[PDB]
Symmetry: C4
Subunit: 354 residues, 4 copies
């Protein structure tokens, strides 16, 4: 970062971090229309999805109903781990016996996490996600490496989360089959406020990709996505898939009863590091609610439609070509101009609410 901002060390403030709202994809020469785009992409080294989307491993987003629906829509669910091992394993079996659908499951770090992992593999899980706030901790890299050693022939092992090139490189050397990027950008996340730590999500992807791409390891962009265009941006920055919590938490298939506050409909959505999920603790998430959004299938159709539009605009027949697209950086005025502006919206759009 060139500009003088204090002190005598030019590396103290090491770069300028961008996130989704900071950039637009540039249109390019195209012989692609949304209809002819191919949205398939690698979830891991061995697993390719038809639709490059996976649901967050959260107790207000993914249990078996969500996992089943995501798989049928061409993506995948990652089953959360805030429940007894026998119950998480049973949910893996529920998905597996609905057509041999793909499914993943989260585990932590340690002895209990290891027992959880072995049970999940026994239940037939396809992907284990080592699900942590900071994968550059040595204990996490150990967990990833040992799982890959012991069961890596039977199962794919994802490691996360990271926000730097060096952390992505450490997970690759540990043997990760994919690397999940996102420290702090989650809609329900307070890590960046409470700890003061993280990196803006576009820059975090660009950096992780610089480590993972040359090693042939897919990057999963996790957190901070709010519009279908954000998915296109994350993939163009080099991710192969995107993980969604907020965008899916409001759907019929997410766990939770409908909340009916003041004429409107909502579903609860909460961080896994919130007090409520963990039950003095120092939480790194909040508890809240999102608008009810109806069937998962209709949300995914809108998201994939927006991604297909982006592929047509950028002349990308495949996700692999989308990953080569270019950005322009924009100002606050640019962002206001990008949204609808100076008009009163009178009708809801299925892919846009202010």
């Amino acid at each position: 970062d060139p500009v003088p901002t204090g002190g005598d060390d030019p590396h103290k403030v090491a770069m300028l971090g961008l996130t989704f709202d900071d950039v637009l994809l540039l249109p390019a020469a195209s012989d692609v229309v949304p209809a002819t785009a191919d949205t398939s992409s690698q979830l891991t080294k061995k697993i390719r999805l038809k639709v490059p989307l996976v649901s967050s491993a959260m107790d207000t987003v993914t249990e078996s109903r969500m996992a089943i629906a995501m798989a049928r829509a061409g993506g995948m669910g990652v089953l959360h781990r805030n429940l007894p091992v026998a119950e998480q394993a049973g949910q893996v079996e529920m998905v597996k016996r609905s057509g041999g659908l793909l499914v993943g499951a989260a585990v932590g770090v340690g002895g209990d996490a290891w027992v959880r992992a072995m049970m999940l593999v026994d239940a037939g899980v396809d992907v284990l996600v080592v699900d942590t706030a900071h994968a550059h901790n040595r204990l996490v890299l150990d967990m990833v490496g040992k799982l890959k050693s012991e069961v890596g022939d039977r199962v794919e092992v994802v490691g996360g989360n990271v926000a730097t090139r060096s952390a992505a490189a450490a997970l690759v050397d540990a043997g990760a089959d994919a690397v999940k990027v996102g420290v702090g950008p989650g809609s329900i996340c307070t890590t960046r406020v409470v700890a003061g730590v993280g990196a803006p999500q576009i820059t975090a992807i660009l950096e992780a990709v610089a480590a993972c791409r040359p090693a042939g390891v897919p990057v999963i962009a996790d957190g901070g996505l709010q519009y279908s265009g954000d998915i296109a941006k994350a993939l163009a920055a080099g991710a192969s898939t995107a993980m969604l919590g907020s965008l899916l938490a409001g759907t019929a298939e997410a766990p939770g009863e409908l909340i009916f506050v003041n004429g409107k409909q909502y579903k609860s959505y909460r961080g896994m590091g919130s007090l409520g999920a963990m039950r003095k603790l120092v939480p790194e998430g909040i508890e809240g609610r999102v608008p009810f959004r109806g069937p998962l299938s209709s949300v995914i159709h809108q998201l994939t439609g927006g991604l297909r539009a982006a592929m047509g605009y950028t002349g990308s027949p495949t996700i692999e070509v989308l990953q080569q697209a270019q950005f322009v950086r924009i100002t606050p005025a640019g962002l206001k101009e990008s949204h609808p502006h100076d008009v009163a919206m009178t009708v809801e759009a299925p892919n846009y609410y202010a």
Copy 2:
């Protein structure tokens, strides 16, 4: 773009995009006053307007009443294409038989669009606008080139929309008589959110102009304009005309009945890519309403008055000289200072509402 923002490719984030609110025109030495300014400008290679303004080809902005009024005010209307071919053609005839006024009409891409185009030419249209979200698609360049080949002796052919230098260059090589710039900046547009694609409108004009100006092809700045000063900025960036939807949709001549909500008056205004206009679809516009603004003539007087003021300030006797003016880039504080600030407005101004 010099500053490090992630990864190892300096061309990934290729430049900084500016739009109207990011810049001001610098005053210069002047022997021009608003009264003596000459606002005429090229719409196309062959067509010069007295006032460098054209109304959007939208079903809530331009049918024959709007086209007639815009022509009489010294500009032009582009008749929308969300209606049967015989009806669009009939409206062209309505305008033509009100004094031989100039008129344009939108067409799409394909066989039905081609039949539409031939009928419009037969009705006496002066300008065909190949009206698309992404003119850098090969199908659009083909449509432009074939129209120019078949009927280009009888009619001027405009192509759009683009947001890059390379896309403008492709339209010029395809034979466009003008190039329309604007991917996503429209007030009712969600393309930049839904697809994540576009470029801020001042930068988009500067880039398109770098391709079109040396080839002698006029650029039409389309979308994102909200104040008379925006028109001056778009022209100074090198456009020859500006296309307006939002600013004209509220006028008496725009299609639509007056809406009377809660003591106030409005007219409907909607994207042509909204669900409502297209009638599961994945829309790229919204449906809404804008304040009623009275007769078109009075709006155009205010817009041209603001443009004339800019010409006096920049010492520009003609639009061609305005296109040589300089900008200063501004911060959010600069923008707040540019608007009225720290005062409660007690009376409406005819050319300013907060």
Copy 3:
């Protein structure tokens, strides 16, 4: 401006404009306390004020009561010109016969303005202000030069307004005794929106000063000031005095009756380019109201107290040394941190309202 923002001309977007909220003064080594600071400064080549403040030539800010009070407080008023010549001249006499106080008066450009000017000189005015939106117009430079030729032995002649180095240089060569800077930053001004023209006020001062300082011509910073700290910033950027409209319009001495809306007290304040002041016109100002602020003397005490504080902080015993102080440029976060933040204000401060 180094960063790529579109096109092939590096001078198209010629620099980055800053205004007051973009910068802070850096504290420095000091043997000055607010009590020992000397706030005197040149209004013009020949006229030094005890307090570097002058009231705007506006019909809601300065008639004779305001002019008298400003002079007694150690500054000066400039009498507005939206009234018959005999009446403006009479007000000059009212001030002159209240102790031989300093007074200025605005005039325009042309034959009627020239008659106005001669009458004002006859009435004993000390300063003529050629009061225009764009002093880089040739007609204005002619007016300034001819006044200085004809009556420049009897009276000081101020010219404005400008926002560029070249325009300030032209006024200096025309013979101006001071140069007034400010195109568009006024609180009631819409020029930057309606015409799209101007330059952020700190940059406008820095540029004008680069022309005026080496010629020994004082710069008057006109418009955009809202806090006592803004006065210190304008002077540190190199201005010698500041002109205030909004900050003084609410005082007892400003023309206007008190407005009592919904339990509170206000006074009308309006641009001289508003429809109301000019009485289809294309206005460049709005009509509004500001909070009532009580006696002028108490406002000026607060403003000078804040300026004296700045002088103590920067180690400036005199305004001439304050003009050598340094800035740091700040971000939106910096600006939020500069104001009170994260607290509910329960008591009014005499020099701060949110």
Copy 4:
């Protein structure tokens, strides 16, 4: 500062100032977990705290109850000086006789301040804080140097406040045992608005540290902190401790009765430069209220928990290693993404309110 912003002097606008919301800490390789972090740090050359936090010397933040509680929590209180000397001294004795707890006390500059200081030393104070708005004034450096000469064997002497490298260097040469950084960032402070003076707090720390670190003098980051992550940022920028007013003013131990406005609970909090504290004056602070936050111990637990999280993320076993961490600079979009976003919070978190 490279970019052209006006005039011909590249040093006029000398750098870009950042504050807390402008930066995030980058995660790094770590063998630290929050539990194993060591939060101890130097308050002064001779005094090490277990927890790197000290309460502001304000009459709505620190009297003896607060000083006692802060010391027991592993930090320190600085007793305010808006009260008679015998009473401030008595409060020092109250703290000293509650277990020989550490305590500091503020003094001003001059003869009365000197008498106050001698009485405080006699009462057994551990730290004298020369408590001023501008320590680069020569009178302040004299006060610091004379105290260190006369009583510097018995007591540690802190000097502040500063916002520049040169001012920190002057205090070091004057003999300060620590340097307090912060000109204007306080939540109740208006200095930056009223005087227009200051520097954004991250840059102010980086600059002061460049002077103090090589001389082995600890820096106290004072003002502007609102979240536990801010404490981690201030320390990573090189401060050794942080001083808090706003974050502690709402606690049970802060002076003040509970205010019960409209169903909610608050405590008064006011600048020491506000009219109310000083009792025409020209104040540099405001009077207000903050939410009631319960026992001090629980607030400090949340703050230290967030700091420990940051240490785990950055791989810092000690504060000395945290001081070597790196930042990424972020945009407004980055800041929105850092907070919770696009969710309605339904439950209060103990370490986060919007």
